């Protein structure tokens, strides 16, 4: 059975001051000589800005996971009590954001930071 041999990590709305041009950028699927340069103009990007935006994305992901809501198992109603054992009906709460998704995202951040030379992002991970 065929699968996709690569994951995806996309940074939305990266701006090129030399063009005022807005587009996304895929750090995993896009080939080199295009991550470091604008699509239209062939002007090199600044690397610390890329690394800072990656750190921003990772921190926003962590905060978004930590601020998630709880959903019941059988019925998909939202938890509306600050403290309760479980749903009035049968079923236990589960989070909207699963753990495995963010674990895999952190793994792909590790892979991306290891492929290129990104010391600041490595130190960002190491502080956790």
């Amino acid at each position: 059975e065929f699968k996709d041999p690569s994951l995806s990590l996309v940074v939305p709305d990266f701006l090129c001051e030399y063009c005022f041009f807005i587009s996304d950028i895929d750090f995993c699927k896009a080939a080199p000589e295009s991550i470091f340069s604008c699509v239209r103009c062939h002007k090199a990007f600044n690397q610390v800005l890329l690394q800072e935006h990656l750190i921003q994305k990772l921190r926003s992901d962590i905060e978004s996971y930590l601020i998630q809501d709880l959903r019941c198992s059988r019925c998909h109603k939202v938890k509306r009590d600050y403290m309760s054992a479980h749903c009035p009906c049968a079923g236990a709460w589960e989070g909207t954001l699963p753990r495995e998704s963010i674990v895999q995202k952190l793994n792909v951040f590790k892979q991306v930071a290891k492929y290129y030379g990104f010391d600041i992002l490595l130190s960002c991970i190491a502080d956790l």
């Binding site: 939305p12 709305d13 701006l15 001051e17 005022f20 807005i22 905060e63 601020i67």
Partner: protein, 230 residues
């Protein structure tokens, strides 16, 4: 290393002129020499200059010569921008296009009856002090920046047209109580009229208006510019 003060003093007592300043440490150089506060100075910060560790003489010579012989064009452009934007000479920068938009929009709102919510040294709008508090709706509306896309796989034996769309944001802006996530429609209409007159002026042979309209979207995205709102 002490001759900078001597040169500045001799220039001060030899002529009353404007000074072009270009360095990554503008504030540090302003603080090192006390005579710099006594003259009108225009700053032209183009930082992030480095050395190739070898054969630096010709590259630095090229930098200096192009700077000195393009300062005329630079000051001509600055004069054009200042005499169009009703802003003094020393308060403008070549790349600081957002500042002009901010000041003119604030002036238009001041002639109106809407509070500016102006802010300094902080990339948040002024809401009376409430903005520093964490809130769920705000934190959700800052971080939802993903743009969806459509992809339908398959093999096509028919002809396919690859087209490109440009100036979508400006068209979206120009074209088109109960809801709490709504932005004040008064400001939206004000900026729509502003952009309409901007477009009309840029049509009638105005490079400055065209460049400013081009930079409008980058101003909208960038939170570093003042008068920003998520």
């Amino acid at each position: 290393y002490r001759r900078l003060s001597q040169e500045t003093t001799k220039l001060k007592e030899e002529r009353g002129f404007l000074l072009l300043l270009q360095s990554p440490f503008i504030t540090k150089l302003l603080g090192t020499i006390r005579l710099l506060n006594q003259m009108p100075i225009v700053k032209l910060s183009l930082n992030e200059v480095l050395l190739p560790q070898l054969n630096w003489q010709p590259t630095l010579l090229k930098k200096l010569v192009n700077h000195v012989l393009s300062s005329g064009s630079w000051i001509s452009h600055l004069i054009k921008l200042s005499q169009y934007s009703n802003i003094p000479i020393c308060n403008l920068r070549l790349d600081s296009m957002d500042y002009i938009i901010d000041v003119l929009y604030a002036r238009k709102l001041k002639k109106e009856n809407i509070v500016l919510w102006w802010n300094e040294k902080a990339p948040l709008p002024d809401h009376g002090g409430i903005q520093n508090d964490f809130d769920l709706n705000t934190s959700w509306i800052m971080n939802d920046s993903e743009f969806p896309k459509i992809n339908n796989s398959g093999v096509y034996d028919n002809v396919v047209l690859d087209v490109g769309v440009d100036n979508l944001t400006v068209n979206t802006i120009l074209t088109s109580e109960f809801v709490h996530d709504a932005f004040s429609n008064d400001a939206l209409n004000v900026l729509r009229g502003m952009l309409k007159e901007w477009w009309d002026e840029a049509l009638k042979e105005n490079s400055t208006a065209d460049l400013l309209v081009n930079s409008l979207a980058s101003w909208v995205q960038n939170p570093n510019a003042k008068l920003f709102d998520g």
